[PDB]
């Protein structure tokens, strides 16, 4: 018997939008420590991991661990019937091939009850060696998404390069070429819309912008985003879900060596 309520159900809406276009089915692992999701897209180029921990919820309860397999498009369609002010409760029996989503207006006598049919999944967790990255660029989220969307119009691939003083995104195509140079905010120390870099090692790598512009569906979740990069390893784009945990997109580089 699983029950999770959020007074601020906006977050659930945002997650599903951040996900629905990159992946279409995924298995939501529920346990008493909270909610966990790891699924790959159709071309196994990108991987997403979602952690919402139990303490973030206003009400959490998980008698027996669950792996519920969820059509994410179905789920987003339902979640678009919730208001941003709505209080959202998730409920599912031990077995039950169904998930209930309940949405209540804080401040009106309106209550919505949706029963989402689940699906038989069984994915198989990949394992994510946890490690140190040559570069970690923390910047504003709107900005990263502006950069990804603009350079799309130049080319199909972006080359991201990092040293101690800033990062640069480059791209090429029929049109021409272009480079955007972002520099470490020297204001910093206690600033909000900054750019800060943990370079240990110059990196320079190359990713498809298609997947990057899927990741920036996550923008509404946090004012700020981080890119972790190292020589021969997928890139991590991370959005912190204030007070609950995080969404991490992982992306396999383009390479010829």
């Amino acid at each position: 018997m699983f029950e999770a309520r959020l007074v601020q159900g906006s977050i659930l809406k945002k997650v599903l939008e951040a996900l629905k276009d990159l992946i279409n089915e995924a298995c939501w692992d529920i346990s008493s420590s909270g909610v966990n999701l790891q699924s790959m897209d159709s071309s196994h180029v990108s991987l997403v991991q979602l952690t919402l921990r139990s303490e973030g919820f206003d009400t959490y309860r998980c008698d027996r661990n669950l792996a519920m397999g969820v059509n994410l498009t179905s789920m987003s369609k339902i979640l678009k019937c919730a208001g941003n002010e709505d209080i959202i409760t998730l409920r599912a029996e031990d077995n039950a091939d169904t998930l209930a989503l309940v949405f209540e207006a804080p401040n009106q006598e309106k209550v919505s009850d949706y029963e989402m049919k689940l699906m038989d999944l069984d994915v198989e967790q990949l394992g994510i060696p946890e490690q140190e990255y040559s570069c970690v660029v923390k910047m504003p989220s709107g900005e990263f998404a502006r950069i990804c969307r603009d350079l799309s119009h130049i080319g199909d691939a972006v080359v991201i390069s990092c040293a101690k003083d800033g990062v640069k995104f480059s791209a090429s195509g029929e049109l021409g070429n272009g480079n955007i140079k972002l520099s470490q905010t020297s204001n910093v120390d206690k600033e909000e819309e900054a750019v800060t870099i943990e370079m240990n090692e110059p990196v320079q790598l190359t990713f498809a912008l298609r997947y990057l512009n899927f990741f920036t569906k996550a923008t509404p979740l946090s004012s700020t985003v981080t890119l972790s990069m190292s020589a021969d390893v997928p890139l991590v784009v991370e959005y912190k879900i204030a007070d609950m945990g995080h969404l991490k997109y992982y992306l396999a580089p383009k390479i010829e060596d």
Binding site: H44, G127, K254
Partner: peptide, 16 residues
Amino acid sequence: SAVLQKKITDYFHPKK
């Protein structure tokens, strides 16, 4: 062009 796209599986493997 300039390269080719790796998969996420070439880097992350089934859970020990």
